[PDB]
From Swiss-Prot:
Location of Phosphoserine modifications: 64
Function: Phosphatidylinositol (PtdIns) phosphatase that specifically hydrolyzes the 5-phosphate of phosphatidylinositol-3,4,5-trisphosphate (PtdIns(3,4,5)P3) to produce PtdIns(3,4)P2, thereby negatively regulating the PI3K (phosphoinositide 3-kinase) pathways. Required for correct mitotic spindle orientation and therefore progression of mitosis. Plays a central role in regulation of PI3K-dependent insulin signaling, although the precise molecular mechanisms and signaling pathways remain unclear.
Subcellular location: Cytoplasm, Cytosol; Cytoplasm, Cytoskeleton; Membrane; Cell projection, Filopodium
Domain of life of the organism encoding this protein: Eukaryota
Organism: Homo sapiens (Human)
Post-translational modification: Tyrosine phosphorylated by the members of the SRC family after exposure to a diverse array of extracellular stimuli such as insulin, growth factors such as EGF or PDGF, chemokines, integrin ligands and hypertonic and oxidative stress. May be phosphorylated upon IgG receptor FCGR2B-binding.
Family the entry assigns: Belongs to the inositol 1,4,5-trisphosphate 5-phosphatase family.
Residues covered by the SAM domain: 3-65
Stated name of the protein: Phosphatidylinositol 3,4,5-trisphosphate 5-phosphatase 2
């Protein structure tokens, strides 16, 4: 019931920010489906309290849908 072992892994690779993966995965963003609705303030909840990091995710959203 789980053939992936990644989810948003390769997703963060498109922008080179997978380092924050575990940061959002251990908060409740492991689901790329839900992360697709993540807000700007939600990123800081996973440890993404950076400007270049906050603007990256938003761009990575529309990128890989």
């Amino acid at each position: 019931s789980g053939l992936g072992e990644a989810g948003m892994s390769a997703w963060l690779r498109a922008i080179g920010l997978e380092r924050y993966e575990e940061g959002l995965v251990h908060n409740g963003w492991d689901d790329l489906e839900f992360l697709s609705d993540i807000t700007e303030e939600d990123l800081e909840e996973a440890g993404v309290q950076d400007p270049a990091h906050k603007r990256l995710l938003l761009d990575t959203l529309q990128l890989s849908k």
